[PDB]
Amino acid sequence: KVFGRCELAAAMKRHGLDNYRGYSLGNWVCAAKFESNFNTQATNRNTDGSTDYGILQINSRWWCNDGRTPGSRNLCNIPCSALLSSDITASVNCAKKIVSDGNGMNAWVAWRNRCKGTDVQAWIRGCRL
Ligand SMILES: [Cl-]
Ligand SMILES: [Cl-]
Ligand SMILES: [Cl-]
Ligand SMILES: [Cl-]
Ligand SMILES: [Cl-]
Ligand code: NA
């Protein structure tokens, strides 16, 4: 599924991401834009051999199991393929665990380099939420 901007904003809000750990909704929409271009099926292999999955590009090194990341963990207790569904529930629940870790949203490289400090509210402008 390729979400629209406001479509994704509404889904993230319904799942309780708005202001989760203090991060406003536009931070999450911005992160999804630059991580996956709003595409739930996005996958990208990392240099260390792990892979990032889904709308928020969750990494198999710590968070999901894909059977090909030696020495990795599965802390969201989910197959990485479940993070590619059109229903973003699993991705949101796992992202809540990620952002609750010590570094907050800095765990998302694209957020840190392309969203952090910017006018992220622009990402929900015009949305009926
Ligand atoms: Cl593995
Ligand atoms: Cl959804
Ligand atoms: Cl934080
Ligand atoms: Cl950018
Ligand atoms: Cl915002
Ligand atoms: Na893993």
Q: Check the annotation: does 48 bind a ligand.
A: no
35 carries an active-site annotation: yes
Cβ within 8 Å of residue 43, ≥6 positions away: 51, 52, 53, 54, 84
Domain count, the chain: 1
Out of 7, 18, 48, 52, the active site residue is 52
Measure CA 110 to chain center.
10
Q: Which ligand is nearest to the CA of 74?
A: 6
Return residues with CB closer than 5 A to ligand 2 (ion). 11, 87-88
Q: What Å distances lie between residue 98 and 2, 43, 90, CA to CA?
A: 23, 18, 12
- Rounded to the nearest angstrom, the distance between the alpha carbon of 111 and the centre of ligand 4 is 9
Active-site position among 35, 48, 66, 119: 35
Residue 2 tokens read as 């390729």
Closest CA to 111 of 57, 45, 61: 57
H/E run at residue 14: helix 5-14
Q: Which domain holds residue 3?
A: 1-129
Burial of residue 125, with CB atoms counted within 10 A of its CB: 0-12 exposed, 13-18 middle, 19 or more buried: exposed
Residue 66 sits in a domain whose CATH number is 1.10.530.10
User: How was this one solved?
Assistant: X-ray
**Distance between CA 127 and CA 129 in Å, rounded?**
6
Q: Look up residue 52 and give its DSSP letter.
A: E
**Going by C-beta distance under 8 Å and a sequence separation of 6 or more, which residues neighbour residue 109?**
none
